[PDB]
RNA sequence: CUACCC
RNA sequence: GGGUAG
């Protein structure tokens, strides 16, 4: 205590400075007013210049116009909350209309003209409030659209008005052009990239007017992009602005656009990172049913929330015990989760998208200075985001020596709470210092204990989801003879016991029914707890009365509505959403619980465009009701892709494509086209000519032409595609060929496999003397295998990996391939493999139908080359179930050698390296999966594994030739684990060939047969393989070349030469859409054609029907249409502020699904679920439907985007 | 159930 | 069979 705490307030409410900055500027002011304030006025610029190592990343833009004189601004702070407050507003508004009177262009002018007032606020607040930039534009008619606060645009036109300059400023705001015309560039910024790409291009070997053409066209596009001219108007992205302008009676001159924090780059601060470092300094000086409470810390920057969250960690470590950017710590009763609230607009994008909700925020305010002016925006963010409860902590109280003065600050926070309808009178306020508690000062450590003593009490215990009014999302429905109607899904909330009454509410009149019973897969329980994945039986109600997305809750618990107010975030461009804003008539689908629902939206008063990366309040009125209550997270899909997220706020009162077009296309889609011969051979020929290269003379040369491996990448690429494109043309006329040849090989794949299987059974040469390279590797591989594998497949890892999947079984066929027709229909087991199926049968109360019991798999033939076919083999559907389980445990496990098979990227990326590096070699075997000996496999795998592989495998096979064979190969293609095994085998050995040569085994990467290793190892790997039986595809194995190929990617000196193949006979316009598209990808860079390919594209493009030449789509959307610019598509209609397009689909008459087997599978899926932009968790899995390919083509409509 | 591939 | 995007 020094002087009275009383009229220190006289300082504050006449000044606005700190509390102790007021008392301490009074202790050396002799109890005087003015001369105390003059200390502040002079010692306010000292702190104001203390602000310079505080980067100002936030702020506002403000804009003004008079008659036809317009001005923008970039006055900016370092925090949202400040910018939105009535102070930063008042100054920045003032400093804006100061440019209205005086056309101030030099920022220096007004940056100085208010420097003495710029300090009046940073002394009041505590942030580097500095003006960044200013500019202004004069003209005829100049309009300005202000996007809330963050983006300001000033644009000047001619012949235009508010029915325009508004709308185009919106585009400038939206599209962000740097220039205005393609002619508005310097022949230096142009001849920069014009000499930057010309080498990039010419290095390839492409002539003068190829590279020159290509580059000029690409730069013509590059210019065209930023070209406000060459820019698709944001409200009509069909016509360009420049086109919109000339088509209008008008012509703009100039434009100014500011955002906030351009270039103000900075470095990204994590919270949970630096707080583990703020702690690390002070470091050196049963009950798991305990609730989760999401707390947040909120307050000024320099009041050091940072410092306090740290104390609330260490002092809680000291005492009890112990979405990233959050800290997980405990308390003896509860377990919290704690986050920082720096950005108002980034906390909404946390609550809305649900990355971090709030069950109670903590209000940090340094007692030294008390409530800052912008704090009412912190408290405002609470009663804006609907935070339930609020605890306040006054940090740094040692910096006050008078309690009579501390009690005065609670006044100025308790009344600041109460303005915002928070229990200010009855709200907890802790007085202490974190700084003292970081140390070891337990007198002040009792304050964090007094604070954490409030989170334990003043925050209510979260209604644990079990305890909430029962509710289940209807995910799918089955009509079982014997059970009636049954729905499956994970129950969201509550418990459902057998018999209770439930409503079935969703779209129809909220009907009601009763739980005839509940069941899982193994258990057939009687109560269904929340969080569990179940199937509930309903009576007196059939399937057709129950849709999906319906809920299944207690009666009256939740009513169905269709009108509600919500708040949503829209995914930014870089986040996945639209790269285009929408306007008044947005009509998306609203993905709710399990189903998508379309719907219109209103914009609140005064907002007219919203862009990717926005928060926004809106009112949603969807086409037909869904059951809802406040707190329901719904994403927002546009044609299957999630471009928004949002939660319902308040539930309310309640309330163009040409069909002739689609039908015109459907007509033409089925238009079989007629050619005077082989269209392919024609196209490929007329293409080779298009490149100087000598064409095919006969139809034999298509597959007997071997390329050359010299020449420029260009001389290659083409020469390669030549030898490659035709390879797979099945329909070759006097192709005196067959599939018999496929069989002829499969005979060696056992005939050799015989030879090895045998000679692989006597490794004692004669007497010990000779020591072979193979045997050694096997020995090494064997050891290596078992460290990776196990002595036997863990049933744990076995059951949660086995599945019914795909297509043909011995008992089924491609029609009856979908998994439900495996539980419905009995599948074949195999003698040895019986025991497992029996396990399944005591593993559930369901029906496990074994049809025949035979050791036979059907060996057949599927098409491959034009010179041969495959000889896959269709396994006994039960063997396949387990084979797929051991194929999965042998794959998740195979990932420790750095082998990922659900990612063939990491094996083709390395083909890239190899093509340049020359130290990596791609390899290929002749009959890969087929030449794996029953002998070899025994020598490597553990005996316990080699059992389970002899058990599941099919030992004998019946041919179409009637004749049986007994497998020398352990496993054939089509077998349910063969891929993973041959991976692991090949990987095993490459790696042994590595250790054996003092080489990193970690440099070995295998994908099935597509194994990649160090180039030096190859002749050893080759000599190993020669021994272990396999034989090496010299033609496809590449070590010394400039060329590497792997996982379907081909490379030549780091350069992409992946060809495309013309498989089957081109006939329907879908087969020409397809070929024209592969040639489009193969010869384009960003919609910019390699000229001499464009020639044939354009030519054979004429072959398609008139409408089927203009119907373009972006790449990566299918082949239902030619890829091109969808901005052009005449058939593309603008529905609901989202563009929709028509693409060729295959026709499907629907069919009957096995309600039994579909249900059997749906609940088997939940057994496999249960034992295995942060918002895709919302979206669930799909019901089983079956459909049959008719032959006709239908036209389906989808959703699209520019680029 | 369309493309790409091991 | 298996990935990968539809
Ligand atoms: N089970 C199964 N595996 C396949 C099939 N197609 C390709 N593969 C895998 O792809 C690997 C290599 O395929 P390819 O390189 O095309 O054929 P390959 O039989 O191994 O030998 P070649 O084509 O003669 O060089 C094989 O080991 C197979 O495991 C198939 O239809 N069924
Ligand atoms: Ca191969
Ligand atoms: Ca290969």
Coordinates of C-alpha atoms in Angstrom, one line a residue, chain A residues 494-725:
Chain A
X494 CA -28.7 -43.6 -24.4
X495 CA -29.6 -47.2 -23.7
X496 CA -32.2 -49.4 -25.5
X497 CA -33.4 -52.5 -23.7
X498 CA -35.6 -55.2 -25.2
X499 CA -39.3 -54.2 -25.4
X500 CA -39.1 -50.5 -24.7
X501 CA -41.1 -48.2 -26.9
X502 CA -39.3 -46.3 -29.6
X503 CA -40.4 -43.8 -32.3
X504 CA -39.1 -44.1 -35.9
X505 CA -38.7 -40.4 -36.9
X506 CA -37.1 -39.0 -40.0
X507 CA -39.1 -38.1 -43.0
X508 CA -42.6 -39.7 -42.7
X509 CA -45.1 -39.1 -39.9
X510 CA -43.0 -40.0 -36.8
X511 CA -44.3 -43.5 -36.5
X512 CA -43.8 -45.6 -33.4
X513 CA -43.0 -49.2 -32.8
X514 CA -41.3 -51.6 -30.3
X515 CA -38.0 -53.3 -29.8
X516 CA -38.7 -56.9 -30.5
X517 CA -35.0 -57.4 -29.6
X518 CA -31.4 -56.3 -30.1
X519 CA -28.3 -58.2 -31.3
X520 CA -24.7 -57.9 -32.4
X521 CA -22.8 -60.4 -34.4
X522 CA -21.6 -62.9 -31.7
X523 CA -23.8 -61.8 -28.8
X524 CA -27.6 -61.4 -29.1
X525 CA -27.9 -59.0 -26.1
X526 CA -31.0 -57.5 -24.5
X527 CA -29.9 -53.9 -23.8
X528 CA -28.2 -51.6 -26.3
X529 CA -25.8 -49.1 -24.7
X530 CA -24.6 -45.9 -26.4
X531 CA -21.4 -46.2 -28.4
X532 CA -22.2 -49.7 -29.4
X533 CA -22.8 -51.0 -33.0
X534 CA -26.1 -53.0 -33.1
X535 CA -29.1 -54.3 -34.9
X536 CA -32.6 -53.7 -33.3
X537 CA -35.7 -55.7 -34.1
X538 CA -39.0 -53.9 -34.7
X539 CA -42.5 -55.3 -35.0
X540 CA -45.7 -54.3 -36.8
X541 CA -43.7 -52.3 -39.3
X542 CA -42.1 -53.4 -42.5
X543 CA -39.0 -52.1 -44.5
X544 CA -40.6 -49.7 -47.0
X545 CA -41.8 -47.4 -44.1
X546 CA -38.3 -46.8 -42.9
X547 CA -35.8 -44.7 -44.8
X548 CA -32.1 -43.9 -43.9
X549 CA -31.1 -40.9 -41.8
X550 CA -34.2 -41.5 -39.8
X551 CA -33.4 -41.8 -36.1
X552 CA -34.7 -44.3 -33.7
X553 CA -35.2 -42.6 -30.3
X554 CA -37.3 -42.5 -27.3
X555 CA -40.8 -41.0 -27.9
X556 CA -41.2 -37.2 -27.9
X557 CA -37.4 -37.0 -27.1
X558 CA -36.7 -35.3 -30.4
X559 CA -39.1 -33.9 -33.0
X560 CA -38.6 -33.6 -36.7
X561 CA -38.1 -30.2 -38.3
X562 CA -37.2 -28.7 -41.5
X563 CA -36.5 -25.0 -40.6
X564 CA -33.6 -24.0 -38.4
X565 CA -31.1 -21.3 -37.8
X566 CA -27.5 -22.4 -37.8
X567 CA -23.9 -21.3 -38.0
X568 CA -21.5 -22.8 -40.5
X569 CA -18.0 -22.6 -41.6
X570 CA -17.2 -22.9 -45.3
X571 CA -14.1 -24.9 -46.2
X572 CA -11.5 -22.7 -47.8
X573 CA -10.0 -23.3 -51.2
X574 CA -6.9 -24.9 -49.7
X575 CA -9.1 -26.8 -47.2
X576 CA -11.2 -28.8 -49.7
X577 CA -14.2 -26.6 -50.3
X578 CA -15.3 -24.6 -53.2
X579 CA -12.7 -22.2 -54.7
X580 CA -15.7 -20.2 -55.6
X581 CA -18.0 -18.2 -53.4
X582 CA -21.8 -18.5 -53.5
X583 CA -24.6 -15.9 -53.1
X584 CA -28.3 -15.6 -52.2
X585 CA -29.5 -18.9 -53.7
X586 CA -27.2 -21.6 -52.5
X587 CA -28.9 -25.0 -52.7
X588 CA -26.6 -27.7 -51.3
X589 CA -27.3 -31.0 -49.6
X590 CA -27.1 -31.2 -45.8
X591 CA -25.4 -34.4 -44.6
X592 CA -27.0 -34.9 -41.3
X593 CA -26.6 -38.2 -39.5
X594 CA -26.3 -40.8 -42.3
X595 CA -28.1 -39.3 -45.1
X596 CA -27.7 -36.3 -47.3
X597 CA -30.5 -33.8 -47.6
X598 CA -30.9 -31.0 -50.1
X599 CA -32.1 -27.5 -49.1
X600 CA -32.2 -23.8 -49.6
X601 CA -30.7 -21.1 -47.4
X602 CA -31.4 -17.5 -46.4
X603 CA -28.6 -15.0 -45.9
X604 CA -29.0 -12.8 -42.8
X605 CA -29.5 -9.1 -43.1
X606 CA -26.9 -7.4 -45.2
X607 CA -24.6 -10.1 -46.4
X608 CA -24.7 -11.1 -50.1
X609 CA -21.7 -13.3 -50.9
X610 CA -19.8 -15.8 -48.8
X611 CA -16.5 -17.3 -49.8
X612 CA -14.5 -20.5 -48.9
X613 CA -12.9 -20.0 -45.5
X614 CA -15.8 -18.1 -44.0
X615 CA -17.8 -18.3 -40.8
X616 CA -21.4 -17.2 -41.2
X617 CA -24.7 -17.3 -39.5
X618 CA -27.6 -18.6 -41.7
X619 CA -31.1 -20.0 -41.8
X620 CA -31.5 -23.4 -43.3
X621 CA -34.7 -24.8 -44.8
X622 CA -34.1 -28.2 -46.2
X623 CA -36.5 -30.1 -48.5
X624 CA -38.0 -32.6 -46.1
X625 CA -37.6 -32.8 -42.3
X626 CA -35.0 -34.6 -40.2
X627 CA -35.2 -35.3 -36.5
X628 CA -33.0 -32.6 -34.7
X629 CA -32.1 -30.7 -31.6
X630 CA -29.7 -27.8 -30.8
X631 CA -26.2 -29.2 -30.9
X632 CA -26.4 -31.2 -34.1
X633 CA -23.4 -31.1 -36.2
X634 CA -24.2 -31.3 -39.9
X635 CA -21.7 -31.1 -42.7
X636 CA -22.6 -29.7 -46.0
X637 CA -22.0 -31.7 -49.1
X638 CA -21.8 -30.4 -52.7
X639 CA -22.1 -33.4 -55.1
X640 CA -20.5 -35.8 -52.6
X641 CA -17.7 -33.5 -51.4
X642 CA -17.9 -31.8 -48.0
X643 CA -17.5 -28.0 -48.5
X644 CA -19.0 -26.8 -45.2
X645 CA -19.7 -27.8 -41.6
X646 CA -22.0 -26.3 -39.1
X647 CA -24.2 -26.7 -36.0
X648 CA -27.9 -25.9 -35.6
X649 CA -28.3 -22.9 -33.4
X650 CA -32.1 -22.4 -33.1
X651 CA -34.7 -24.7 -34.6
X652 CA -37.5 -22.5 -36.2
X653 CA -41.2 -22.2 -36.8
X654 CA -41.3 -24.7 -39.7
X655 CA -42.3 -24.4 -43.4
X656 CA -32.7 -25.4 -63.8
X657 CA -31.6 -28.3 -66.0
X658 CA -33.5 -29.3 -69.2
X659 CA -34.9 -32.8 -69.0
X660 CA -34.9 -32.7 -72.8
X661 CA -31.1 -32.2 -72.8
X662 CA -30.4 -35.2 -70.6
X663 CA -32.7 -37.3 -72.9
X664 CA -30.9 -35.9 -76.0
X665 CA -27.6 -37.1 -74.6
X666 CA -28.9 -40.5 -73.5
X667 CA -29.9 -40.9 -77.1
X668 CA -26.4 -40.1 -78.4
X669 CA -24.6 -41.8 -75.6
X670 CA -26.0 -45.0 -77.0
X671 CA -25.0 -44.0 -80.5
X672 CA -22.7 -46.9 -81.6
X673 CA -20.2 -45.3 -84.0
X674 CA -19.0 -46.9 -87.2
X675 CA -15.5 -47.0 -88.7
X676 CA -14.0 -48.4 -91.9
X677 CA -11.7 -50.6 -89.9
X678 CA -9.7 -50.7 -86.7
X679 CA -10.3 -47.3 -85.2
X680 CA -7.6 -47.8 -82.6
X681 CA -4.9 -48.9 -85.1
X682 CA -6.0 -45.9 -87.1
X683 CA -5.8 -43.5 -84.2
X684 CA -2.4 -44.8 -83.0
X685 CA -1.1 -44.7 -86.6
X686 CA -2.4 -41.2 -87.4
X687 CA -0.8 -40.2 -84.1
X688 CA 2.6 -41.6 -84.8
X689 CA 2.7 -39.7 -88.0
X690 CA 1.7 -36.7 -85.9
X691 CA 5.2 -37.1 -84.4
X692 CA 7.4 -37.9 -87.4
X693 CA 7.5 -41.5 -86.1
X694 CA 7.1 -44.4 -88.6
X695 CA 3.6 -46.0 -88.2
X696 CA 2.4 -49.6 -88.2
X697 CA 2.1 -51.3 -91.6
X698 CA 0.5 -54.4 -90.3
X699 CA -1.4 -55.4 -87.2
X700 CA 1.5 -57.6 -86.0
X701 CA 3.9 -54.7 -85.7
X702 CA 1.7 -53.4 -82.9
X703 CA 3.2 -55.9 -80.5
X704 CA 6.6 -56.8 -82.0
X705 CA 8.0 -53.3 -82.0
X706 CA 10.7 -52.8 -79.3
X707 CA 11.6 -49.2 -78.5
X708 CA 15.1 -47.7 -78.3
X709 CA 16.5 -46.5 -75.0
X710 CA 18.7 -43.6 -76.2
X711 CA 17.5 -40.2 -77.6
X712 CA 15.9 -37.2 -75.9
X713 CA 13.0 -37.9 -73.5
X714 CA 10.7 -36.8 -76.3
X715 CA 12.3 -39.2 -78.9
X716 CA 11.6 -41.8 -76.2
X717 CA 8.2 -41.0 -74.7
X718 CA 6.5 -41.3 -78.0
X719 CA 8.6 -44.3 -79.2
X720 CA 7.6 -46.0 -76.0
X721 CA 3.9 -45.3 -76.1
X722 CA 4.2 -46.7 -79.7
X723 CA 5.4 -50.0 -78.4
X724 CA 2.9 -49.9 -75.6
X725 CA -0.4 -48.4 -76.6

